[PDB]
Enzyme design. Sequence first.
Site: not given
Ligand code: HEM
Ligand code: ARG
Lengths: 362, 362
Positions: A65, A68, A237, A242
């Site tokens: 992520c 974070r 968001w 993505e």
């Molecule tokens: C606030 C805005 C957030 C942004 C911009 C963001 C951004 C991202 C992005 C770009 C990815 C890669 C997803 C992909 O390639 O499919 C990701 C993965 C992830 N995010 Fe975030 N995230 C956010 C919030 C959160 C929140 C609230 C959580 C959980 C409490 C979280 C937990 C994760 C996890 C667990 C992954 C890995 C998912 C997977 O392995 O398929 N994120 N995040």
């Molecule tokens: N910004 C995030 N929390 N992304 C979570 C994964 C979403 C996913 N990669 C999608 O395009 O639908």
Amino acid sequence: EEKEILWNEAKAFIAACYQELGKAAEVKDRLADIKSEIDLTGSYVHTKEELEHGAKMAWRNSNRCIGRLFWNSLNVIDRRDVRTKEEVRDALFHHIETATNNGKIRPTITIFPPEEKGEKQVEIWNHQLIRYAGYESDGERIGDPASCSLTAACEELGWRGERTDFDLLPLIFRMKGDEQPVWYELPRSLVIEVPITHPDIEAFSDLELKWYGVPIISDMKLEVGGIHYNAAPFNGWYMGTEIGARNLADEKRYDKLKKVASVIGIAADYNTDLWKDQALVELNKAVLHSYKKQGVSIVDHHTAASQFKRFEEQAEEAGRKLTGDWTWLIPPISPAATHIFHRSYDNSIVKPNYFFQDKPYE
Amino acid sequence: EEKEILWNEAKAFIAACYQELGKAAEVKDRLADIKSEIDLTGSYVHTKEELEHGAKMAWRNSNRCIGRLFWNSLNVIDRRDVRTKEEVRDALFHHIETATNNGKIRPTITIFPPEEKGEKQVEIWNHQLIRYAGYESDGERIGDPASCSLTAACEELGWRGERTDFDLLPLIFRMKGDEQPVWYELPRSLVIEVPITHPDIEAFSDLELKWYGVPIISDMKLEVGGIHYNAAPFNGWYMGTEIGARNLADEKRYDKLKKVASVIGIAADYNTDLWKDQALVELNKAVLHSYKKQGVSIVDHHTAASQFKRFEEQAEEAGRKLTGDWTWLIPPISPAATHIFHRSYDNSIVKPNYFFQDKPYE
Ligand code: HEM
Ligand SMILES: NC(=[NH2+])NCCC[C@H](N)C(=O)O
Ligand code: HEM
Ligand SMILES: C[C@H](O)[C@H](O)[C@H]1CNc2nc(N)[nH]c(=O)c2N1
Ligand SMILES: C[C@H](O)[C@H](O)[C@H]1CNc2nc(N)[nH]c(=O)c2N1
Ligand SMILES: NC(=[NH2+])NCCC[C@H](N)C(=O)O
């Protein structure tokens, strides 16, 4: 033999959690009560404070992520009280409504009762609460191929999709004791969608592209101090890439790059023209422009990386080890333009965290 | 104790090499002669066939290289006969001339005598035979910052750069027994350079960008069957992104993206405009267009990835394990548009191979 694993994870968690909250003195007494509770019941129950902070810690430990920086502002909804599928359904509806927040998205997690004997109380089948169906039948490709198997599973349950490229899948989950999941059609009033237009290429509308506002992952397990919350949907968001570089661009997804090249008026004949690269940029500009124009929260990959750098600095200042997955942290367009590309990340797993689970369909 | 390591690597190499060449029956007798040679001299000498194939195997094992499809067409020049710095100099000059081949670049390696007791016979200081100098002095940034330390080292030897942004560094190497390296100015007639213009944006010429035709890495150690060829410069042709997305784009390099955005007529004010991404695409289009127009070999990252996929298939068909470094194989622009992005690679080290060496300067 199960008490031992639970008890050790519990000690590590409470000691670290209470430490961070400044409750270091209350650890010994809290650990005692837990030790008794485990002995009696075979498990223990988190306080609302522990559950909330554990969910935040889990986000902070999510190596993949880039978002974070905002781990500590996560809105945690404690729904460990639900017992009926109507209550699960309304909890899911509410999560969508409150996280959406009329476009100004709130990072939110709704936490359902945890596994008992490894037995799930609630089992959510959706990958995301809001996602588009996918169909393949004799040459036909409609919608999102990533959703083909779940879509087929839903159509085994009496649901039928309209077979547009953007059918909203129903919510589908199974309650403990039931053999089949139930499904509920999403109220369209709860689901914000964004039509994709380009800031200065008006022909872009001819692609008739759109995407949904809020990505709410609903199939990952939240693990907090030995407790397994298999059902705990969370959202942030979107980062533009993505949607623009993957969901709409991948050949195994919506595969729109040739059509984009056409509407932006460039040839898609020669690799050396870098038409895919040019189409990717314009598509990703359109996505950012569209969400902003619609008043739906989104972040571009440069701003996101800057924020992530602040997360790195914050971690160093707080004395915390940083962990990350370089291969997922780098954005899929212009990654070398971000600082992420030029440094290394330790991909160790730290708990609390979010984990993958096997899919009940397929 | 040194014979043991040499002997074991030699066995592994000859057995595998001769196997691939169909000389499987000549292994036992060749290994005997080597075993005797090591006993007598403390080392052994490769046949021209082994040296040639070993250099090819080394390229095939280069985990970071996307251009490995053409491993077997490598032109190997055996210069283990050189004893004087004039001979080294003329060998280096010749390598440049023959590899350049009037623009139709030949992948070439020139192999100099190997280390003896770990003692280098020839020590090349250049990172690449052809590269641009770099200067920093009291606010001033001129040329290629990646070359700052080597440039400073050369100016300790009586050389002086003109301090344009594209000073060609002299060849600089040290012979065994000498305390200081010598330097020779490159004949400009041997060095092809490409002025960077854009296919349809004529103002792009105002940036006055250029780059050199042939990337000839001259500071890596070739290891073949226990033998350490510390001096063995090699070249392929460029992939466009190496120049357009890194050399000219990186902030710690030429840092040209703002100037590009200006000449292509876009604002560089907002991250959400994705101006860096757009500038990267146009800069990389200009690079490909320029080399092609000049009749100098180059490959775009899409074609290169397609070729690399054929390398993967070829490896599977031949029963060979594939190794690679995902983090280096993915191109720095639109990596998700390549198949590389979507699969995994085992980053194990297989010998023969090319390795890093400590720099005599800095
Ligand atoms: C606030 C805005 C957030 C942004 C911009 C963001 C951004 C991202 C992005 C770009 C990815 C890669 C997803 C992909 O390639 O499919 C990701 C993965 C992830 N995010 Fe975030 N995230 C956010 C919030 C959160 C929140 C609230 C959580 C959980 C409490 C979280 C937990 C994760 C996890 C667990 C992954 C890995 C998912 C997977 O392995 O398929 N994120 N995040
Ligand atoms: N910004 C995030 N929390 N992304 C979570 C994964 C979403 C996913 N990669 C999608 O395009 O639908
Ligand atoms: C024929 C055309 C070739 C192409 C298009 C090609 C492509 C590439 C590219 C793009 C890189 C990454 C370089 C960087 O990011 O700085 C690379 C690295 C490398 N290539 Fe190739 N290559 C070619 C030929 C060769 C040859 C002839 C050899 C040696 C016999 C070779 C060995 C390597 C090695 C060792 C690296 C890693 C260098 C390092 O670690 O810094 N390649 N190649
Ligand atoms: C930290 C990271 O490993 C490093 O910046 C790498 C990433 N991938 C790369 N890939 C290539 N081709 N060239 C490079 O210089 C780098 N840099
Ligand atoms: C094979 C590779 O690990 C895989 O395709 C990963 C690469 N990096 C990624 N990074 C993100 N953000 N999302 C992804 O789906 C992937 N896919
Ligand atoms: N195609 C190659 N053989 N590249 C080798 C590395 C060249 C280096 N990346 C440069 O831009 O100068």
